[PDB]
Design an enzyme around this catalytic site. Sequence first.
Site, PDB file in Angstrom:
ATOM      1  N   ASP A 187      -6.480   0.459  -2.458  1.00  0.00           N
ATOM      2  CA  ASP A 187      -5.261   0.954  -1.823  1.00  0.00           C
ATOM      3  C   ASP A 187      -4.586  -0.187  -1.063  1.00  0.00           C
ATOM      4  O   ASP A 187      -4.996  -0.519   0.051  1.00  0.00           O
ATOM      5  CB  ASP A 187      -5.594   2.126  -0.898  1.00  0.00           C
ATOM      6  CG  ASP A 187      -4.377   2.695  -0.211  1.00  0.00           C
ATOM      7  OD1 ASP A 187      -3.246   2.313  -0.570  1.00  0.00           O
ATOM      8  OD2 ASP A 187      -4.555   3.561   0.672  1.00  0.00           O
TER       9      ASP A 187
ATOM     10  N   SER B  61      13.490  -5.345  -2.977  1.00  0.00           N
ATOM     11  CA  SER B  61      13.965  -5.356  -4.348  1.00  0.00           C
ATOM     12  C   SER B  61      15.463  -5.630  -4.363  1.00  0.00           C
ATOM     13  O   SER B  61      16.197  -5.237  -3.448  1.00  0.00           O
ATOM     14  CB  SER B  61      13.645  -4.022  -5.031  1.00  0.00           C
ATOM     15  OG  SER B  61      14.224  -3.950  -6.314  1.00  0.00           O
TER      16      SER B  61
HETATM   17  N1  LIG Z   1      -1.379   4.225   0.265  1.00  0.00           N
HETATM   18  C1  LIG Z   1      -1.603   4.311   1.694  1.00  0.00           C
HETATM   19  C2  LIG Z   1      -0.317   4.774   2.375  1.00  0.00           C
HETATM   20  C3  LIG Z   1      -0.099   6.124   2.599  1.00  0.00           C
HETATM   21  C4  LIG Z   1       1.072   6.539   3.212  1.00  0.00           C
HETATM   22  C5  LIG Z   1       2.018   5.603   3.594  1.00  0.00           C
HETATM   23  C6  LIG Z   1       3.308   6.047   4.272  1.00  0.00           C
HETATM   24  F1  LIG Z   1       3.683   7.270   3.785  1.00  0.00           F
HETATM   25  F2  LIG Z   1       3.100   6.112   5.622  1.00  0.00           F
HETATM   26  F3  LIG Z   1       4.276   5.121   4.011  1.00  0.00           F
HETATM   27  C7  LIG Z   1       1.803   4.256   3.366  1.00  0.00           C
HETATM   28  C8  LIG Z   1       0.634   3.840   2.754  1.00  0.00           C
HETATM   29  N1  LIG Z   2      -2.293   6.837  -0.323  1.00  0.00           N
HETATM   30  C1  LIG Z   2      -3.699   6.895   0.050  1.00  0.00           C
HETATM   31  C2  LIG Z   2      -4.314   8.111  -0.632  1.00  0.00           C
HETATM   32  C3  LIG Z   2      -5.055   7.943  -1.789  1.00  0.00           C
HETATM   33  C4  LIG Z   2      -5.603   9.048  -2.418  1.00  0.00           C
HETATM   34  C5  LIG Z   2      -5.403  10.312  -1.893  1.00  0.00           C
HETATM   35  C6  LIG Z   2      -6.013  11.519  -2.601  1.00  0.00           C
HETATM   36  F1  LIG Z   2      -5.357  11.713  -3.784  1.00  0.00           F
HETATM   37  F2  LIG Z   2      -7.335  11.273  -2.848  1.00  0.00           F
HETATM   38  F3  LIG Z   2      -5.878  12.630  -1.814  1.00  0.00           F
HETATM   39  C7  LIG Z   2      -4.655  10.481  -0.739  1.00  0.00           C
HETATM   40  C8  LIG Z   2      -4.106   9.377  -0.107  1.00  0.00           C
END
Ligand SMILES: NCc1ccc(C(F)(F)F)cc1
Ligand SMILES: NCc1ccc(C(F)(F)F)cc1
EC number: 3.4.23.22
Length: 330
Positions: free
Chosen positions: A35, A199
């Site tokens: 992630d 972008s």
């Molecule tokens: N993939 C992690 C993640 C989840 C949510 C956000 C947000 F919504 F806060 F931008 C950023 C990064």
């Molecule tokens: N963006 C981070 C994230 C990654 C996976 C999930 C899920 F799908 F496992 F719930 C939620 C949030």
Amino acid sequence: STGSATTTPIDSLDDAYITPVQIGTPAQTLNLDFDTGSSDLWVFSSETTASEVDGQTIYTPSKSTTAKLLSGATWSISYGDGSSSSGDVYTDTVSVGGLTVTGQAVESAKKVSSSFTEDSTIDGLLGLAFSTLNTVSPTQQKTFFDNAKASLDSPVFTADLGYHAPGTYNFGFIDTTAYTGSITYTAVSTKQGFWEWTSTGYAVGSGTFKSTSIDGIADTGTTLLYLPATVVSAYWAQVSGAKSSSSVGGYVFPCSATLPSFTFGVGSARIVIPGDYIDFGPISTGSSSCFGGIQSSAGIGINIFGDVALKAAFVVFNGATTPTLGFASK
Ligand SMILES: NCc1ccc(C(F)(F)F)cc1
Ligand SMILES: NCc1ccc(C(F)(F)F)cc1
């Protein structure tokens, strides 16, 4: 040193990707969601509430001879979709595709939200954003990438996600056989802890390219592409019968329609997302309404170049002292 690991979609829609990670001595292999939008390495464990575990592989620190409890440390995280988890913190040895870090903070979940419990294929997350976002208290902890940086041949990792197919995360080197043409690098702002970039515009299908600055984050942990309402409205206007549905929570389209491609700008280069990448299938089993892979960021507050966009490209996360993002066609 370097590392290389295969990453595999968890289902037929590429909703997420999992990568095997070795934790502890002897190795306990868990399949983690890499992630770049978060900075915590957390896992289902022997300490997780038993009712909140449904098929996941769990990390058992008591069976690892290198695991050490980080006395007094806790963590708590909430994700942008409402997901959350929390627990305590161990340090242990962590290896990804041959690349080993000793003394990595491994955050052990005592409690997880329902959306993780229901995702039997994801054993945890491996955060790859900047360490300023790590939630460990009272002593903040470094990410796997930050800990590995010193010993990597080059302070980079690359994301090569597949469309309905396996892909690769590489650490420490750029595979010049994995892309075509040149890599276009663009500046990153670390001020919010994300891989944030700008972008240079977009095009819908074979339409004119619209030069306009879209600030957003490169996030392997988010499935879809979230863009400003003006952009998303111009895309779905080209799809006959598409509409925004409040009951569903986004744009849907007739499953019989053909979707146009979507182009986004990286400096002077163009990354083209094939229309098939934007189809996320029926909203319910048997439905003839399908869910769109491009949605509005209006409710979120930030634009997100998620997997839909990233899997159209070879992506370099350059963690040099001045960080940059590189995009190449593939
Ligand atoms: N993939 C992690 C993640 C989840 C949510 C956000 C947000 F919504 F806060 F931008 C950023 C990064
Ligand atoms: N963006 C981070 C994230 C990654 C996976 C999930 C899920 F799908 F496992 F719930 C939620 C949030």
